[PDB]
């Protein structure tokens, strides 16, 4: 089964470069196209770049003309994004997919076989703001109890909640996190449950804040 | 430069037709497999339609019996792939692939039998 | 590239209908994508017309003159997400801006809970109190904070999660940011929700 995996996005200061990987498996590497698109956060699709290696075609949306360098390794199956001068406005989840080898030749207006398989995207953040890791304060609960997991002040996103380490899907809302005056981030996640259980059934918040390697279990016991 | 050149493809509405043509250089004589392969968005490219250029066997392609036909005009080099009775189903970039080197007509129609490709023509079935 | 209704709110079962400008005078076949909330988008609809494989049959495409259509012949609650077209000019790829597709609903009421800051939390200086907006509908909602009565400006923010993917309701938290010195020179906290005809109201006392 196909799949592209992505990596190498993180944060860098303006002006700074980085260079992001698409690790394409399931499918001869030669016979297709790999493209970047990449979305600033609330906004749409911006395509932006692609290869074909075994033809080493390239092209380049206006917007990063200059400053960004696509190339593959059919050796290993890889296509990377070389990003230089990066700014604010680079700032964007960057997704990469797979298109036709030969679809700028193919493209017509009765055919375009679009891209079907993507990546999960990889954020990078372009900021002078350095890396500080989350704070996590229970949401401490009171028919059916409600409780939670405040987690703030850090940076940069993303930072993904869990409960009971995955066995525990349902009820769970995460919040998207929000930018505080500060600069920094914050998000809570909470869950209801039965008030007949917070006696018996123990309940661990799971934190992971990847961009400072950190993660933070945290339990959620009722206040007395 | 040995190299291979598709031409023909359009849309089509379903039970339409359409015929498809390959056209090789360098020196011909020497090919032994002539085949039409197709591949759409998010699916494997399949064998569709093998010709044996010396004895001119076909070998087709379970979803295509009956309604896809390739043909050889060794006047020309060129093969053929007359599609009829088209249906959604059949929208792909159809492509045209040769090989030299004999391998038994059990592999006619597979990917790997073959050395060289087109680039492709795209067909498009639909209401 | 502009699609048309850039937004969009229609109820379970309805039919719904995108549509897309070609950009450039040289027509080129339109793909269509779905993606959720920060998420990779997914194929939908290439070659105009063509359904990608897997997708399900309620979704289709087609010309109208010369442009381009998206229908959901059945909208249905996993649909709700930003649709977007695609096209090729000569070696460039471009989309378009997006299309937002929100399901359209009855009414629901939130359960509202508040919370104290914890313990923890104070030690240092700061104090969060939170109010959870749970399984509401639509998600347009005043959340107002009250301290020993008194309203508060510019120290809230809210944050709603997207739709349920099987009942359509939003849930919203508004985080009230006090320092540790203010809260306790305070005693009751409270937030209100307002929804056309009803404001409900939690509150806790600081001696709990």
């Known amino acids: 089964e196909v799949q592209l995996v992505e990596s190498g996005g993180g944060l860098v200061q303006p002006g700074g470069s980085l260079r992001l990987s698409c690790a394409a498996s399931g499918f001869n590497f030669s016979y297709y196209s790999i493209h970047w698109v990449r979305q600033a956060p609330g906004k749409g699709l911006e395509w932006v770049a692609y290869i074909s290696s075994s033809s080493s075609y390239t092209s380049y949306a206006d917007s990063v003309k200059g400053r960004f360098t696509i190339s593959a390794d059919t050796s290993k199956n890889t296509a990377y994004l070389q990003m230089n001068s990066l700014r604010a406005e680079d700032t964007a989840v960057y997704y990469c997919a797979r298109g036709y080898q030969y679809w700028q030749y193919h493209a017509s207006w009765y055919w375009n076989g679009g891209l079907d398989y993507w990546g999960q995207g990889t954020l990078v953040t372009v900021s002078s703001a350095s890396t500080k890791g989350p704070s996590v304060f229970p949401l401490a609960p009171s028919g059916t109890a409600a409780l939670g997991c405040l987690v703030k002040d850090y940076f940069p996103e993303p930072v993904t909640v869990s409960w009971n380490s995955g066995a525990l899907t349902s009820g769970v809302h995460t919040f998207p996190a929000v930018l505080q005056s500060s600069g920094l981030y914050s998000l809570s996640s909470v869950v209801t449950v039965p008030s007949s259980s917070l006696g018996t059934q123990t309940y661990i918040c799971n934190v992971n804040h990847k961009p400072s390697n950190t993660k933070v279990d945290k339990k959620v016991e009722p206040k007395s | 430069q040995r190299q291979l050149v598709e031409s023909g493809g359009g849309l089509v509405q379903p039970g339409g037709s359409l015929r498809l043509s390959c056209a090789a250089s360098?020196?011909?004589?020497?090919?032994?497999?002539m085949t039409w392969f197709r591949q759409a968005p998010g699916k494997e490219r399949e064998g569709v339609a093998a010709?044996?250029?010396?004895?001119?066997?076909?070998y087709y392609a379970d979803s295509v019996k009956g309604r896809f036909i390739i043909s050889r005009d060794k006047a020309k080099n060129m093969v053929y792939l007359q599609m009829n009775s088209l249906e959604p189903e059949d929208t792909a970039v159809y492509y045209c692939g040769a090989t030299r080197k004999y391998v038994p007509v059990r592999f006619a129609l597979d990917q790997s039998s073959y050395d060289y490709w087109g680039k492709g023509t795209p067909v498009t079935v639909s209401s | 590239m502009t699609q048309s209704p850039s937004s969009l709110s229609a109820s379970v079962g309805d039919r719904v209908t995108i549509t897309c400008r070609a950009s450039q005078s040289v027509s080129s076949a339109v793909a269509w994508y779905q993606q959720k909330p920060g998420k990779a988008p997914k194929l939908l609809i290439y070659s105009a017309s063509s359904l990608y494989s897997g997708v399900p049959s309620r979704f289709s495409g087609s010309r109208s003159g010369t442009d381009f259509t998206l229908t959901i012949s059945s909208l249905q609650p996993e649909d709700f997400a930003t649709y977007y077209c695609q096209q090729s000019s000569s070696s460039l790829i471009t989309f378009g801006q997006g299309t937002k597709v929100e399901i359209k609903r009855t009414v629901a009421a939130p359960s509202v809970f508040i919370f104290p800051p914890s313990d923890s939390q104070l030690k240092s200086g700061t104090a969060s109190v939170v109010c959870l907006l749970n399984n509401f509908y639509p998600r347009e909602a005043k959340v107002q904070w009250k301290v020993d009565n008194a309203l508060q400006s510019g120290n809230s923010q809210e944050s709603v999660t997207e739709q349920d993917s099987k009942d359509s309701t939003y849930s919203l938290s508004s985080t009230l940011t006090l320092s540790k010195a203010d809260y306790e020179k305070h005693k009751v906290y409270a937030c209100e929700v307002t929804q056309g005809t009803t404001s409900v109201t939690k509150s806790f006392n600081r001696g709990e």
């Open positions: 360098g020196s011909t004589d020497s090919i032994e497999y």
């Open positions: 010709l044996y250029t010396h004895t001119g066997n076909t």
